[model samples]
Target: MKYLPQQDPQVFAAIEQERKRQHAKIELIASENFVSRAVMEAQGSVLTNKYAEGYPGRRYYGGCEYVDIVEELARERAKQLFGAEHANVQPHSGAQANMAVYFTVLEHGDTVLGMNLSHGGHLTHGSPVNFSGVQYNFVAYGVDPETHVIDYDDVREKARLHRPKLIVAAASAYPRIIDFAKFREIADEVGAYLMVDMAHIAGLVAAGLHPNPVPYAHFVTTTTHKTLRGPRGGMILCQEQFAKQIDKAIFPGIQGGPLMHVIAAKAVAFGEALQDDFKAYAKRVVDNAKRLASALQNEGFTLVSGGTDNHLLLVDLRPQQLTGKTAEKVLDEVGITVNKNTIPYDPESPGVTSGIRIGTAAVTTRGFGLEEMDEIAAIIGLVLKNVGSEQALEEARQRVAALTD
Candidate 1:
């Protein structure tokens, strides 16, 4: 019954219209994707009725025996997919997964060395307004002001000076590949456990295109959506030693019951990732990202960190004489979607950041190729080049329609 998109004509129409809009638009949000229909079916499956509280067999409730097998398969698939020592596919979301990790790993007032928010770090990594900052002391490292990339030396210095319990190597807007080896060195120097949040790049990590945090960081966390192209959910991975604590953290420390349906969907996603086609898709996602970034660079606009090696990149709008918020609005009008994000040491406030974060993952899921990326880049370039003109946005929308058609 939950899959009934046609229960209400108005709501169904809205969903269809939105899909059409996405189909017609250039979706470059790094943290968004189109999930497989199989994953969707599993998310709405009868598994949702069962309350699989604890791990397999040892559940907090009954009737979950069958779903338990699905959950176990999910874990085994994750281990095989990423070479992780242990994997927990229970946490409800990336934020929830990180919360459990924090509860498991840190005490109150303990220090966590995370990348600074303005420099592309995630909110859970340590914004003052978030629980990570409120419950624990979060010292932040930042990207280099000169190059706009993570400053490994600076992070090491901070870890040594702060003597943190945990060091987080993660980001939401970063364009380059994050080296877990460098983070491992910094954590070792300070005797801090390293936690890599690869929520933005998990699918790529599973495909061997990006450097995985396994065998390097102490714990890893990621959302099942985003680049994973699964049901919207979260997962945790760690060495076998931390498995019990990680499970307990999610089980009792933060959440009450697990979403069995979503867990089953995650199994579907993880299994799909193990196939040969998933690797091809992951490689294409990165290729499309690079192609789009290069095309944008040719438009005389400045890209944050110059370019990208992964699925996402940031564009500096000030170079094109446009504010970040202005670009977000204009792009929305033109059926292209991207999020405004703060650059490293940005001069503008978050309400109007100096840059926009874009990706190729979601559109690429719709079977878009390099040719589509080139067309998207052209429309985006035109919109930015003629910022604030309604006529320009209208023209760009038509161009976007051509691609979807």
Candidate 2:
């Protein structure tokens, strides 16, 4: 950093600006969180200089003895954290981890059953734009209209009809507890491989706050960053029977050399997840989400699914007569940040979503509690209620300043 600051002040300045922004704002993006300084230290270490082109002890390249330990530590810690039979800490991101799983198990054009994008599924699950959809045939299952929860019966019906080779049980914006056991039952009924993408709740899973998917699903994948509070990278966990395939798919199937430094950071984060404070932190994240949900509801903000059981909440702004894009912009201007998201059966286009997604992970990490969440909801209500009113916006900004400053 010392040399980079002197050599490239422009990039250094940008990084400094981002650091200041995070410190000065309330970040509520459901998929984002702040990593520990220890995790950052590992990611910024000299391990980045090494290149390990293969798994530990089997690398094609030389000079990987030290990196070998880092990867092993990561793999072992991940497996231990999730109680999985095997772990691969190499995929560059969660999408890559998913791609590796598909590559390992299914051939081109294989039938798969996944949750619908509009119903909270990730792009990698089956959106037409992603490789998963383009390379494979995907049938979609959606949540119940009334309850806004996954309809187990509907999933079973889809599986029986499609008879997909794989059934993906995951979501990007879902708020309820995923019944991995029921999903396993459905996958068994259809004789399909079950894969759970737990990217959004890895930290909760690790802390035992959420049900562990490793025991039920044939393959489980996650990003180390989000709720896990690690480096921005992905990992895959699978039964020993499929470990060899998953490993090959990651190493030579889709990715090249792994990022040893990020893996090192992931190892540090995984080690942290095993601690008592991490469990407390995860509990607090859920507590904050529930508190935020109640506060937002009190402000008359309509929460998708009526509330959350995890770290995030999806707010349907139709009740407010505001577009999600405008809400996002207004909140950003007032030192509060959130992303526009689509709810189940959204009528608006993706570019102008009808809902906004909010989370407590980052703010909870910053030690925010119920009172702060109440204040945040108050600020949001003010801005959305007076979208074009500068005076209200300024008042919201000052209240936000009081919180962050």
Displacement of the residue 95 alpha carbon in candidate 1, Å: 0.5
User: Under the 3 Å rule for N, CA and C atoms, how many clashes does model 1 have?
Assistant: 1
Which segments of model 2 are wrong by more than 4 Å?
none
**lDDT (Cα, tens digit) per residue for candidate 2, span 285-374:** 999999999999998888878899999999989978988899999899999999999999999877799999999999999989888999
Q: What is the TM-score of each candidate against the true structure?
A: 0.97, 0.99
Given candidate 1, what's the lDDT at residue 298?
A: 82
**Which number leads on lDDT?**
2
Record all residue pairs in model 1 with backbone atoms less than 3 Å apart, i.e. clashing: 28-359
Q: What's the residue-level lDDT of 305 in candidate 1?
A: 85
Supply the TM-score for candidate 2.
0.99
lDDT of 1 by residue, 1-405 (tens): 345465787787787888777777677788999888899899877877777778898887878769879989999999999999999899999999999999998989999999889898999999998888899999999887778888898888888888999999989889999989999987888788989999999999999989989889889999999998998989999999999999899987799888988998999999999999999999999999999899888877688888999999889877687778888888888888899889888899878899899989998888999888888888888998887677887888788788778
